Symmetry: D2
């Protein structure tokens, strides 16, 4: 018989006071980290828009909304964007931006909802489905596999696909985990979508359970400018984890998601990718095409 009475239950709030670990030295950096968001890559801009237009799909579904930068560019670019995400900590940043630009017809017609890839089915009305669904930024790797059988993976995937209209497109990516798993390192400065103007340091931790890799953990040591003595910066650190997804595993995974009635194709970093390829991609973007 022991005891450890804690002030407030975990996951509950009180007005007047900041949410639990909301202002920890680790939450602060991650904040100004998820904010290094804006400095997007031309290659990224020119690729997504061109791919988007080239197939004439207008109704886009972003199932990994987040701060809402991918979607804000789609909103500006004229597509019918509906953004969804499971983290209300992230979504808060999209809605903030929207409100500001609510005066803009486009931004006002912008739909930012909340949803989980595992409940997506009963989280977003599909109806006819959407022209295109995007899940970029290596975001599918955030969802872990507790049961070890990747049952939740197939579900998240199954669901996200059902959001795809027949003829619709699915642009889903993942980091080159084959490479990081092989080398045992996932260094900063490879993100193809948004150039991080933030200097960093990353310690890669790879965990294998009974020989099967199960998780890749990243400990970041960000050099926060101005948080130092005389102009000097500060060094805070935060931690995030992902599931090491191998190109092979994913390719078939994402495929059974459509039950086969699909059209698969894998891009190198943004360019076409063919095995044995001389160039090692830092990301693996899968673009699917539902049959019916």
């Amino acid at each position: 018989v022991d005891s450890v009475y804690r002030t407030r239950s975990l996951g509950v709030a009180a007005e007047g006071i900041p949410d639990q670990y909301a202002d920890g030295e680790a939450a602060r950096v991650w904040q100004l980290y998820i904010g290094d968001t804006r400095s997007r890559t031309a290659e990224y801009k020119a690729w997504l828009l061109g791919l988007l237009r080239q197939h004439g799909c207008h109704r886009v579904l972003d199932v990994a909304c987040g701060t809402g930068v991918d979607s804000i560019m789609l909103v500006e670019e004229g597509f019918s964007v509906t953004s969804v995400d499971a983290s209300d900590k992230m979504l808060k940043y999209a809605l903030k931006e929207r409100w500001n630009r609510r005066k803009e017809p486009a931004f006002d017609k912008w739909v930012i909802e909340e949803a989980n890839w595992l409940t997506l089915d009963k989280d977003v009305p599909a109806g006819d489905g959407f022209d295109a669904v995007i899940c970029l930024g290596n975001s599918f790797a955030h969802l872990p596999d507790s049961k070890g059988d990747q049952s939740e993976h197939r579900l998240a995937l199954k669901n996200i696909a059902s959001m795809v209209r027949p003829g619709g497109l699915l642009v889903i990516d993942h980091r080159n985990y084959d490479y990081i798993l092989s080398t045992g390192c996932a260094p900063p400065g490879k993100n193809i979508y948004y150039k991080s103007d933030l200097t960093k340091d990353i310690t890669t931790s790879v965990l294998t359970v009974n020989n099967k890799a199960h998780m890749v953990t990243l400990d970041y040591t960000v050099q926060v400018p101005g948080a130092g003595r005389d102009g000097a910066p500060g060094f805070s650190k935060f931690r995030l984890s992902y599931y090491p997804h191998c190109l092979a595993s994913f390719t078939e995974l994402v495929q059974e998601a459509f039950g086969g009635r699909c059209q698969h194709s894998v891009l190198g970093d943004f360019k076409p990718y063919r095995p044995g390829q001389a160039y090692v991609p830092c990301y693996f973007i899968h673009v699917l095409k539902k049959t019916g």
Copy 2:
């Protein structure tokens, strides 16, 4: 030399996956608690409105927004309302309603920001200061006194008082703690602002540090309807802590937050209050008035 490797830093999120403790069985109830009290009291509506009108103050500031159910009525009532709070888990609900009704001019003009009492100065621009400032719901009792010298209580009240325009009003409240401190119990069904329709149970725990009452902790066991077998209710529980504010104590505290240059009043539940009163108030509402 030990260790305890955790998946994600405390207070950080990842897109696609729900936030840290957002779905515990404690958060689910707390959720239907911060929302299952909303059935505003006629006595409340009529008292606040009337008093607001009586002194003819229009530009109001709600420094304890929360789910916004307070502000939403001032808004609805034509007041120039700006609602603030420190907890984002709470505001999310005020902005969720505002957006919902953004198609209403008043609501559209509704300002919902984020702010902390201890930083309210450089968090919200007053310039001339607001005519009125409410802080009902016993929200002030959420902020604790770690130092033991309530230095923060004073910082909070100074800041919050500084937000009042000369001739301006302040309406800050608290529960009758002189009473629960004595009975050692803080039973449910005493909200004078919103008649909850939720069946609750509460165990009261009072902590006196060195003969001085330092905190009140409420462990609520909510009887969640249907959450059981055959329609039977389920029993989930969360915990919340407060600072026991005694009347004498608060009366002089909130006052020194005005440097004395104020006009203080204190009423019963809603009717006016005098020591020794026959009727025992369930809440103590202070209504101050800045001179200059």
Copy 3:
């Protein structure tokens, strides 16, 4: 679905490495605290021995052994001492002392076993019972009342009494919690048994659940000599909790332990105690006498 993988399970050890929190800055002080043990009080020496002899009981049972100082003096004084305690963290200190003096016939015949007042029955063979059982040092107050009904109290007590031979004696004490509860403070320098040569500071925290006091917590700030800059001492802190036992409650509690077939008597600090007594005792020593 979250996670927080910790290195070693809680409560398990590995050779070569120190036990979990065994060398924390709080464990260090408590160590040199439970060690201030030696500087026993004459009043204490002259009272226990004289009481012991006066009734000619030789077979003594110490159910709150600990470091083993109370028992070491009994061992030296010639009684047939069998010392028992539930904390292997404490017992380790008794055995250490014994081993050293194992060469001394007396110390070799000394019995240091392990046992819980709640399993005492099947933890120590009583047989005929013992002449005298001692539980001094306010040690019975360590066992808390989780269920709130003091069911474990009656059991611990019930058991400890069954260790008493008919005609045997039970010398059990407790701190004057009536006074500390009333004043809300339990200051250092009152221990009647062993003069603590260690300067301290104590913050008393009293917890009441639904008006019924349930626990008294003591936060000690010990002035460790030499742990300072230039001769200066250091200031570490540790924390311990007790159940606020009121003379009245205890008197009847300890009594039902014998089912009434007893002879009760309460000593002031060491002197006889009669209600309304001008002198406020810092400890309450109960000496019982089993009938049969």
Copy 4:
């Protein structure tokens, strides 16, 4: 500003009440694990004794005592044994047996102290140093490398080597980690020292930090016999971590702990070992020899 008030400081005890995590369902198993392997191996007995005799060394030092089952046999065999360890939760068992048999001259002469490899120098007086020093059981793998530069491994080995008299012997061992690192599994029933009679299950988790193997974590699910319904076994589990020591690595590590002035040898499970060997060892036993 939050809080989490806990009953007792971490690592402190109170008399009468069991120690902090001493009785978790994880400690109960770990208990019948650190004890349910003891059925010493004839190959072991015969190898150690013989080698000890072969070099004629008599004053032995067991720097990884534990439950003492090792030393107890050297003791029984007339060796001048002194057994040390850092974990008191373990020694408690060696001294529990010693006392039990204190009535034996050899056992009586048995020295069981407390010590840490990183402090062994000023923890145990050598003067001339011991003839032999065993550290079997793969105990060295318990100490981890937080810094990441194994500076402690070196401190531990230096200290431990310093305890060897010139011409003295050192017998330190480790599991064949070159193998479990590759299969990614560390199955049960491989102790060459004591044939456990316990049915176990083990999930192996390897953590590589930046391409470097940094820790091995074993989650054991013991099938506790009878701990079920009708004689059926129960299933309790504990966790333990180790440092993956590769042969090449250790070979040069333990060597530099002698400044080179040594004679190194390494054998298979017990037989002698040569790289590429046909037989795969389950443990790597290094047997060094100090020159001067």
